[PDB]
């Protein structure tokens, strides 16, 4: 997809930035906000845009950034307070292994978050080894 020469998207290819409703950057008028015909739920970055930023990152030689972008593309589908729930479970001593492994199966099966599910599982194995699970304090 995109390369550094497509960047800034806003500038080079604004038409690659769009909604599921099919809106564009163009009707983010204060009008249509106010006419309640553009909402909060329309103003949320999609996994497609994040994946375009990921290819631009990768083309600029920033592979780790691109990976972060890729994961984020996955997490756009996970509910807000669910995102909060997973982050806190990842914090020291909050969780048991099975909880974490459950979180990864949720991420994998329900939200199809293949990279984050593996990220969480890797965390789960290592918090065992480094003693960061519930009751290790």
């Amino acid at each position: 997809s995109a390369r550094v020469s497509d960047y800034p998207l806003a500038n080079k290819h604004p038409e690659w930035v769009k909604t599921a409703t099919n809106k564009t950057l163009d009707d983010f008028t204060l009008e249509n906000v106010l006419s309640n015909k553009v909402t909060a739920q329309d103003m949320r970055i999609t996994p497609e845009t994040l994946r375009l930023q990921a290819s631009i990152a990768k083309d600029a030689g920033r592979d780790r950034l691109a990976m972060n972008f890729e994961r984020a593309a996955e997490l756009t589908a996970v509910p807000d307070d669910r995102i909060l729930e997973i982050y806190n479970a990842l914090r020291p001593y909050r969780s048991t292994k099975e909880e974490l492994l459950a979180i990864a199966d949720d991420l994998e099966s329900r939200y199809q978050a293949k990279i984050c599910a593996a990220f969480v599982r890797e965390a789960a194995t290592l918090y065992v080894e480094r003693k960061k699970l519930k009751g290790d304090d």
Binding site: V4, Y7, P8, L9, A10, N11, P14, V17, L25, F28, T29, L30, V33, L34, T39, A40, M43, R44, I45, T49, L50, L52, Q53, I56, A57, A60, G61, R62, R64, L65, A66, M67, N68, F69, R71, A72, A73, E74, L75, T76, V78, D80, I83, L84, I86, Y87, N88, L90, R91, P92, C116, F119, V120, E122, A123, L126, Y127, R130, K132
Partner: protein
């Protein structure tokens, strides 16, 4: 006896500072410790089995994160065998391009790059810094805070700051429950000041990300990482939790950075016998490894630790240079007080000021330091005119400009009115008209009418508890007749949708043009090349107040 010479010396402010003898065992030694690890890397079956003398059997969580994500394993062997003095030479040589060096530094281990920069002096670090800086144009960030969490003062100061030239501004709270209010005041004030300034409210992590979920924030910076495992755990985080958090903010389109700083581990109790810089090097590599675009370092909030020992301010400059050498955005501290002496604080600033970093300060106080809720910055609002004349003296772009009182008062005014209308639409505790006036002409919290904190608090919590999102603020500004601040606010959210401002060093200049390291590529090749103060910006800079016409 008593020499009168030494009595005059003894009253100097400088002798109020805290100075310590090096204490190697508790990690009280800024750099070049005898206890630091020697660079090594052993790679078997595409997996790191030895990092800097440590076997994978002994890794801690930090080692696992760095070993798996933080080092380019393809060139790691090649680079490790290279001579560290030649590599330090390449860093400062004007004629070795940034792009020939990035492939190598991102293949080095923490210990290797530490070894490299430790051969340099400050002058060499500075000559290196201006080439390795990711963004070509330098920028600046301010703190906008006050001792009473007063929302009206915050808005007003945010506006003057944005007008003075800061491109990111940061608030935080004396009383944590005030946070929603401080975030909205900052965003509203900043955009009235200059559309595109980026705003952040620094809190506990879960708390702060929900505030970004709600839309009252455009980036976050104080996403903590730490360089030993005990300290990270008292920071209530791991590498994997911080890495998840990072891609969570990206999932909502929010730019963010980590924050580290030499001395955090000594301060928090567990340095594991290691120098501050080395430990800091582990933090920069956690950031690189998470995939985060940038880093606030340069000791930051713990500057009293490295400043107390020998070579501490040089260690600060070197941790900035590792940062940038690793191809991360550097938000280079100059934001916390470490000294009673003006001479000493000025020398510490000039380290990043002269070469220019992505954010020369990450937090110039845009308010008097009595009002600074990070416990004071290295520069404050009483230093503005000094900072401006040094720009002019040296021909160095430090990111700010001289301003006129007339213009300031007006923008602080408009900010205040715009905030008063927002508290209207949302049905928040009234901002009076006398309050507007006070904030227009204030210097600080001392000049502002007292408030009902307790009522303020109940309604600030409301925002969160009823999930009142930034659309309420937008609609509430059009009601008041701030249809500009409303659009300008909408214009931020459009930038959240595009994702361009998530890349290394991004900022929004002008009318919504993002300026990141992807499109403002630092191309430094020595004299006459790279960023040069000149044209209309140079003019802007020489036109300080008090320049007399010689006739």
């Amino acid at each position: 006896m008593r020499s009168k010479r030494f009595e005059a010396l003894a009253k100097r402010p400088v002798n109020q500072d805290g100075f310590v003898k090096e204490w190697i065992e508790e990690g009280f030694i800024a750099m070049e410790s005898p206890n630091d690890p020697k660079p090594s890397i052993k790679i078997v079956n595409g997996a790191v089995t030895e990092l800097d003398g440590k076997p994978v059997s002994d890794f801690d969580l930090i080692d696992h994160f760095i070993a798996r994500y933080g080092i380019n394993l393809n060139r790691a062997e090649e680079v490790m065998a290279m001579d560290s003095v030649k590599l330090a030479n390449m860093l400062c040589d004007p004629n070795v391009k940034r792009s020939e060096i990035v492939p190598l530094t991102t293949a080095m281990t923490p210990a290797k790059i530490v070894e490299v920069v430790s051969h340099m002096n400050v002058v060499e670090m500075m000559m290196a810094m201006q080439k390795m800086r990711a963004r070509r144009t330098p920028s600046q960030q301010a703190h906008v805070t006050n001792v009473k969490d007063n929302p009206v003062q915050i808005a007003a100061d945010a506006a003057e700051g944005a007008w003075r030239g800061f491109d990111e501004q940061e608030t935080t709270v004396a009383v944590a429950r005030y946070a929603p209010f401080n975030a909205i005041a900052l965003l509203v004030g900043s955009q009235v000041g200059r559309p595109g300034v980026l705003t952040q409210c620094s809190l506990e992590e879960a708390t702060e990300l929900k505030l970004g979920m709600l839309g009252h924030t455009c980036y976050a910076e104080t996403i903590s990482v730490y360089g030993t495992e005990p300290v990270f755990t008292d920071g209530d985080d791991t590498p994997w939790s911080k890495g998840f958090l990072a891609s969570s903010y990206a999932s909502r389109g929010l730019k963010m950075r980590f924050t580290s700083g030499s001395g955090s581990e000594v301060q928090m109790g567990y340095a594991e016998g290691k120098s501050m810089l080395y430990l800091e090097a582990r933090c920069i590599y956690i950031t690189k490894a998470a995939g985060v675009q940038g880093l606030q370092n340069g000791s930051v909030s713990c500057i009293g630790v490295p400043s107390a020992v020998p070579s501490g301010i040089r260690a600060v400059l070197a941790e900035n240079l590792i940062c940038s050498s690793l191809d991360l955005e550097c938000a280079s501290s100059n934001d916390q007080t470490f000294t009673h002496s003006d001479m000493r604080r000025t020398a510490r600033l000039l380290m990043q000021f002269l070469p220019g970093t992505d954010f020369i300060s990450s937090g110039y106080s845009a308010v008097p330091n009595y009002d600074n809720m990070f416990a004071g910055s290295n520069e404050d609002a009483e230093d503005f005119d000094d900072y401006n004349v040094i720009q002019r003296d040296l021909k160095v772009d430090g990111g700010l400009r001289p301003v006129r009182e007339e213009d300031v008062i007006a923008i602080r005014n408009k900010a205040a009115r715009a905030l008063q209308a927002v508290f209207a639409g949302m049905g928040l505790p009234p901002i009076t008209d006398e309050e507007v006036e006070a904030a227009t002409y204030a210097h600080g919290s001392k000049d502002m009418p007292e408030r009902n904190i307790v009522e303020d608090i109940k309604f600030a919590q409301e925002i969160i508890n009823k999930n009142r999102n930034g659309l309420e603020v937008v609609k509430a500004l059009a009601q008041g007749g701030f249809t500009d601040v409303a659009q300008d606010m909408l214009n931020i959210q459009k930038a959240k949708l595009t994702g361009d401002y998530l890349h290394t060093s991004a900022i929004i200049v002008g009318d919504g043009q993002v300026l990141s390291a992807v499109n403002d590529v630092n191309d430094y090749a020595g004299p006459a090349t790279g960023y040069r103060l000149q044209g209309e910006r140079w003019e802007e800079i020489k036109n300080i107040p008090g320049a007399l016409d010689p006739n």
